[PDB]
A paper describes a structure:
All structures display a typical three-layered architecture, similar to those of type II AAA + hexamers, such as p97/VCP and Cdc48, and the NTD, D1, and D2 rings show an apparent deviation from a perfect sixfold symmetry. Comparisons of these structures indicate that Drg1 hexamers transit between two extreme conformations, a planar and a helical state.
To understand the structural dynamics of S. cerevisiae Drg1 hexamer, we assembled Drg1 hexamers in vitro in the presence of excessive ADP or AMPPNP (a non-hydrolysable analog of ATP). To better understand the structural dynamics of Drg1 hexamers related to the nucleotide hydrolytic cycle, we analyzed the structures of Drg1 hexamers obtained from three different samples (ADP, AMPPNP, ADP/AMPPNP/benzo-diazaborine). In these datasets, only a small fraction of particles displays an approximate six-fold symmetry. Most 3D classes adopt asymmetrical conformations, with one or two subunits more flexible than others. An intriguing observation is that the nucleotide binding pockets of D1 domains in the structures of different datasets are all occupied, either by ATP or AMPPNP, even for the Drg1-ADP sample. Although the structure from the Drg1-ADP dataset was not resolved at atomic resolution, but the local densities suggest the presence of ATP in these D1 sites. Therefore, this co-purification of ATP with Drg1 implies that the D1 ATPase site likely has a high affinity for ATP and a low hydrolysis activity. There is no obvious nucleotide occupation in the D2 domains of the structures from the ADP and AMPPNP treated samples.
Numbering used by the authors:
A (entry chain A): 28 to 205, 220 to 776
B (entry chain F): 391 to 776
The structure:
C-alpha cells in the first residue's frame, strides 16, 4: 500500500567491502510490492537510457529510508548517476548467457605495470555483479608504492540477443584464491567507441575561463568542505551565487561539470514545470524540496530560468505564480540552518530581467560576471576541443588555430562548436559528392571546409554591449612621437601612480579629449589602447547607444558605466559624441538632454571615479556643449591633426610590404612629398586604388608601375579643405 | 515605499505617528562599524580606531546592509588570499587588514547610488575659503530663527525665509552649502538640478511634494537647491515646453495659503536672467548676495591649504607673490592649477617633497583664467538694478 512512485539515489556509507556492486539498499516493503525475490537481480529505471543497469539486489537493516536508495559509487560513475536524479524500480530482465573477454585498460597510466598487478583478477571478479561497461574501485592498500590508479574495462566482444540492454551485463566465472579465456590483460587505449557510453564532464573541458573557474571552485568548496571554520567567524554563510551572462557563453556546461565533480548531493530543477494551476501545489513542492535539502547536511540547489519563474513586480503583474512563491522560498531558506553547508547557483541571463527582490548580500552576495570570450579564451577552447577530439582524425598546426581564433572576434562559445560541427558536415558532404564514397579517414580536417564554415555559418551574436573588434600592433600606429609619448604618459600615470595620487590628493584628471580631422588617427587609437595597455577595453559607438524607446539610452549608459566601474580600473572609449552632444545647436529631444545631464553628473558628480579613465574622441569638437566642458573634467586636449611625412611614409612602407620596392624603383619619398595633404586612410585608399589599377592590366601582378601611381593620384583628391584646418587651429587657440 | 501605500491608510486619524528612517550618515556608519567590530571581538582580527574612522569617512552612500556586505567580502577575500598564498595556513594569524577592505569597497558597487536626498560630506571652517562679511551675514541669518522664533511669534515679523545666491560659476557656490550644513548642526538636504526633472509627466510634481513635506516633517531646517536656472526660465528658454507646473508649485509652496516660519529657504543660481519675474518679487527671495570671486585672503588661504602636503621652506615661496599674480582666478581654478603644478613637479622623478616655482609658472602660463569681464559687468548691473 506504500506505492513508491519515485526514488532518489544516495551514496553508500561506511566504505568497508560489503557488496560494493550490488548493495541495493531498498526497504523490504518495496521488494514485496514488486513481487520479486530479494535474492535476485534488480532493475533501476533511472528514467530513460534503457538497459536499466541490471544488478543483483540485497537487503537493508530497516534503518535505510524508503525514499533514498544506494547503487554504489562504481555504478554511479559508470552510469553518470548524478545525485538528485529521478530513479525508478521495475522487474528484472532475463539471465545473461555468458561473458567472453572482459579486458582491462589501465586509465591515466603508462601500462607496463607487471609488479603493480599482483593478481588483479581476484579483486575484479571476487564480487557479485561485475558489469563490464565499467568497474571503478579505489586503489586500496596493496604492497608498497602508494599512489592511486583506475582501470578501464569498457572494451568487450560479447554479443547479446536483445539490443535494448546497453549495459549488457553478464555473469562472472574466474578461478582464483585469496582464468577467463586466453588472458584478460591487454591494450591501454581509451574507452570503446562502439558502446558510446556517456562520460562525466571534467574541468579540463572548460577552457578560457580560468580566473573564474578557480573563483567558483573556491566559492563552492569553502562552505561545503570547511563549514566549521567559516561558522567560527559568525558572519553568516553565503547561500547564493549569481551566474549571469550572455546565452551560450558556457554556464550550463560549468553547472554540469560542478554537479558531476561534486560527491555531495545536488538538487536539479527543470524550471517552470513546477508551476501548477493549484495555488498551494507549488508552495508544497517548494517547501518539500527545501525539507529534503535541509534534512541532509550536504545539499546543493540548482535553479534555472529564474526570470520566467520570478518576473519583476514592476515589469508585469501577470499573477498566478508571482513574488509570493519567491518570498516564501526566501523565508524558508533564510532560517533553514545556522552553519550548514549549502550553496545555491542561479544560472540566469541579463540580470536586468532578474527581479530586484533577489539581490541582498545576506543570501546572494556572490556574483559571477561572465562576458564574451576574447581571442585568448577562444584559442584556448579551440586547443581544448582539438585535444578532446584527438589528432588521429585531424591535422592542424598551432598557427592555423591562432589565425582561426583571431578571425572569429565576435563569436560566442557555442559558435566554436557550431563551426567545428559545420566543418565536419561540409567535409563529409564534399567527400561524398566528389570522391564517391572514399575512405573518410584520409579526408580528415582541412582549411577549405572551415573557411566555408565561417562564411556560411551566419551567427546571430553581432549586437552586444561588448565590442571585441580586432586589434593591431605598433606597426600600424602611424603618427607623431609627441602624441605617442603623451598617450604613454596618461596611460601609465594611473597604473603606477595611484598611491602617489592618494598620498598627494591630486588624484587623476581622468579626462582626455581627441578632436581632429575625420581622415585618420581617431579610430586606430582604440586599437592602440586595447593592444598596448593590456587592460579590459570597452568601446561604445555613438548611434549604437541611441534607441527608439525613451530612456533606453539612459539605462544603457547606466549599465555600461556601472560595468566599467565594476570591471576594475580600466579605460572607457566613446567613438562618436557629436551626435548626442549638440543639445543647443539642434533642437534634439528630451532624451538627449537627459543623457547630457547624466553624463555631466556621473563623471565627477557626488562620487568620483578615480580608478577608471575617461577618454573621448570626437570629429567636430564644437558640438560638445560648454555646460559640461568645464576645467577639471575632460580638460586635456589633443590636436591630433593630419599625419606628418614620417607617419605617411611608415603607412606607405606598411602597405607596400606585399609588393616589392626594389623592382618598382620607388623609395616612397617623392611620393610622400607629393602626397602631403592627405590622411592615413586617404593614403591607404590611394594605395588600394593603385593596386587595383595595376592588377587590372594583366590580372595578377608581382609589382606596381609608376603610371598607376600617377593615375591614382590624379583620380582621387584629398577631400579636405584648408579652411577646416584654419577653423581647427582657431578652436585650439581658444582652448 | 510610503508613496506606494494607499493614501487612505496614511491619514492622521489612524496613522498620525510616522517614524522616518533615513540613510545612515558618517557618524552612524562609524558607530555600527565599531559595534560590529566589538561584536566579533579582537581575538580574530585587529582594527585600530583611526582605520575605522577613515573607512567610515570614505563611506558616503552605503547602507546598513552595505557594512555587512563589506565585512563578509573582506573576510572571504582574506580566506581565498590565504589559501592561495600561504597554502592553507591558520586563518587566525592572517586576520583582517586594510587592503582587503579597500578591495571590498572598490568591488562592492552598491546599487543604492540613486537617492532623492543626498548626504553631502561635511567640511570644516579652515578648509572653507571665503570673506568675513559673508560669513558674518550667513551666521546672523542662521542664528536669527533658532533662538528668535519665540521673539518673532510675539512680534509677528517672522523671517524673510528667502535667500538667493547669484555669482560666477567658479567657486563659493557648492562648498558654501557644505559649510552651512557643517556649522549649523542641522540636517541638510541636497538635490541636483536635473535630478528633480523626470521623463514622466507628473512625477516631478510628486517628487516636489515629497521633498517639501519631508522638509516640513524634518523640523525647522534649511532647504538648499544646487541650481535653479535649470528650471526657472520658462518663456526665455522654453525648456521642452514644460516646468510651468513645477514653477507654480514651488511658487505656491513657499508663501501660498500656509506660510513656513520655522524653515529657511536658500537658493543658489548660476545666472540671474533665468529667474522668472514671479520669483523676483519683494517678500519672497528678497535677499541677494553678490558672492563674487574670492579675494586675496581667500586665495592665500586656499594656496596655504594646498601647500600643506608640500614643504614651503624647501620650495622657498612666501605664498604672497603667487597669490598676487593669481588674482583673476577662482577657488576651483586655484585648486586645479595647484593640482596641475603638482603633477608637473612629480613628472620628473615620481614622488617629490616640494614643488618648484618653475612648475608653478609653467602651470600658470599653461592654463588661462577662462573668465570674461562681460559676465562680471552683467552681474554688477544686476546687483545695481536689484
Ligand atoms: N565558452 C564555451 N566553451 C566551450 N563550449 C561552449 C562554450 N559555451 C557554450 N559551449 C558549448 O555549447 C553548449 C551550450 O552551452 P551551455 O551548456 O554552457 O549553456 P548556455 O546556453 O550558456 O546556458 P543557458 O541555456 O542557461 O542560457 C555547451 O554544452 C558546449 O558544448
Amino acid at each position: 500500500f506504500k506505492l513508491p512512485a519515485e526514488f532518489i539515489t544516495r551514496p553508500h556509507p561506511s566504505k568497508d567491502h560489503g557488496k560494493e556492486t550490488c548493495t541495493a539498499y531498498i526497504h523490504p516493503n518495496v521488494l514485496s510490492s514488486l513481487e520479486i525475490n530479494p535474492g535476485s537481480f534488480c532493475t533501476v529505471g533511472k528514467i530513460g537510457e534503457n538497459g536499466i543497469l541490471v544488478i543483483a539486489r540485497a537487503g537493508d537493516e530497516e534503518v535505510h529510508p524508503v525514499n533514498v536508495i544506494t547503487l554504489s559509487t562504481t555504478i554511479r560513475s559508470v552510469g553518470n548517476l548524478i545525485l538528485g536524479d529521478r530513479l525508478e524500480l521495475k522487474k528484472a530482465q532475463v539471465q545473461p548467457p555468458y561473458a567472453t573477454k572482459v579486458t582491462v585498460g589501465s586509465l591515466q597510466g603508462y601500462n607496463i605495470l607487471e609488479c603493480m598487478e599482483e593478481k588483479v583478477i581476484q579483486k575484479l571478479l571476487d564480487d557479485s555483479g561485475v558489469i563490464m561497461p565499467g568497474m571503478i574501485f579505489q586503489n586500496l592498500k596493496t604492497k608498497a608504492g602508494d599512489e592511486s590508479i583506475d582501470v578501464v574495462i569498457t572494451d568487450a566482444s560479447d554479443d547479446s540477443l536483445p539490443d535494448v540492454s546497453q549495459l549488457d551485463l553478464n555473469m562472472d566465472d574466474m578461478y582464483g584464491g585469496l582464468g577467463s579465456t586466453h588472458i584478460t590483460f591487454s591494450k591501454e587505449t581509451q574507452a570503446n567507441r562502439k558502446y558510446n557510453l556517456p562520460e562525466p564532464l571534467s574541468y579540463a573541458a572548460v577552457g578560457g575561463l580560468d580566473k573564474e573557474i578557480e573563483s567558483l571552485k573556491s566559492a563552492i568548496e569553502i562552505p561545503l568542505h570547511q563549514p566549521t571554520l567559516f561558522s567560527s567567524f559568525g558572519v553568516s554563510p553565503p547561500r547564493g551565487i549569481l551566474l549571469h551572462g550572455p546565452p551560450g557563453t558556457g554556464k550550463t556546461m560549468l553547472l554540469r561539470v560542478v554537479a558531476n565533480t561534486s560527491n555531495a548531493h545536488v538538487l536539479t530543477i527543470n524550471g517552470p514545470s513546477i508551476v501548477s494551476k493549484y495555488l498551494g501545489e507549488t508552495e508544497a513542492a517548494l517547501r518539500d524540496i527545501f525539507n529534503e535539502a535541509r534534512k541532509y547536511q550536504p545539499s546543493i540547489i540548482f535553479i534555472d530560468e529564474i526570470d520566467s519563474i520570478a518576473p519583476n513586480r514592476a515589469n508585469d503583474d501577470s499573477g498566478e505564480v508571482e513574488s509570493r512563491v519567491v518570498a516564501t522560498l526566501l523565508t524558508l531558506m533564510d532560517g533553514m540552518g545556522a552553519a550548514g553547508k549549502v550553496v545555491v547557483i542561479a544560472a540566469t541571463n541579463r540580470p536586468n530581467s532578474v527581479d530586484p527582490a533577489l539581490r541582498r548580500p545576506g543570501r546572494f552576495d556572490q556574483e559571477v560576471e561572465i562576458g564574451i570570450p576574447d581571442v585568448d579564451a577562444r584559442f584556448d577552447i579551440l586547443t581544448k576541443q582539438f585535444s578532446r577530439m584527438s589528432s588521429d582524425r585531424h591535422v592542424l598546426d598551432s598557427e592555423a588555430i591562432k589565425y582561426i581564433a583571431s578571425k572569429t572576434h565576435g563569436y560566442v562559445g557555442a559558435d566554436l562548436t557550431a563551426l567545428c560541427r559545420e566543418s565536419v558536415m561540409k567535409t563529409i558532404q564534399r567527400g561524398l559528392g566528389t570522391d564517391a564514397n572514399i575512405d573518410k579517414f584520409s579526408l580528415k580536417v582541412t582549411l577549405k571546409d572551415v573557411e566555408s564554415a565561417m562564411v556560411d555559418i551566419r551567427p546571430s551574436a553581432m549586437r552586444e554591449i561588448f565590442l571585441e573588434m580586432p586589434k593591431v600592433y605598433w606597426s600600424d600606429i602611424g603618427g607623431q612621437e609627441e602624441l605617442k609619448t603623451k598617450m604613454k604618459e596618461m596611460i601609465q600615470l594611473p597604473l603606477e601612480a595611484s598611491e602617489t595620487f592618494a598620498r598627494l590628493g591630486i588624484s587623476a584628471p581622468k579626462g582626455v579629449l581627441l578632436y581632429g580631422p575625420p581622415g585618420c588617427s581617431k579610430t586606430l587609437t582604440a586599437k592602440a589602447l586595447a593592444t598596448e595597455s593590456g587592460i579590459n577595453f570597452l568601446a561604445v559607438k555613438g548611434p549604437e547607444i541611441f534607441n527608439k524607446y525613451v530612456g533606453e539610452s539612459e539605462r544603457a549608459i547606466r549599465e555600461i558605466f556601472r560595468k566599467a566601474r565594476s570591471a576594475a580600473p580600466s579605460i572607457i572609449f566613446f567613438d562618436e559624441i557629436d551626435a548626442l552632444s549638440p543639445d543647443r545647436d539642434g533642437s534634439s529631444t528630451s532624451a538627449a538632454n537627459h543623457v547630457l545631464t547624466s553624463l555631466l553628473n556621473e563623471i565627477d558628480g557626488v562620487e568620483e571615479l578615480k580608478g577608471v579613465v575617461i577618454v573621448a574622441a570626437t570629429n567636430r569638437p564644437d558640438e560638445i556643449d560648454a555646460a559640461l566642458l568645464r576645467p577639471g573634467r575632460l580638460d586635456r586636449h589633443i590636436y591630433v591633426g593630419p599625419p606628418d611625412v614620417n607617419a605617411r611614409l611608415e603607412i606607405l612602407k606598411k602597405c607596400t610590404k606585399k609588393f616589392n620596392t626594389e623592382e618598382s624603383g620607388v623609395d616612397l619619398h617623392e611620393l610622400a612629398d607629393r602626397t602631403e595633404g592627405y590622411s592615413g586612410a586617404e593614403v591607404v585608399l590611394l594605395c588600394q586604388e593603385a593596386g587595383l589599377a595595376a592588377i587590372m592590366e594583366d590580372l595578377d601582378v608581382a609589382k606596381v608601375e609608376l603610371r598607376h601611381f600617377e593615375k591614382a593620384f590624379k583620380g582621387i583628391a584629398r577631400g579636405i579643405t584648408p579652411e577646416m584646418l584654419s577653423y581647427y587651429e582657431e578652436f585650439a587657440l581658444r582652448s
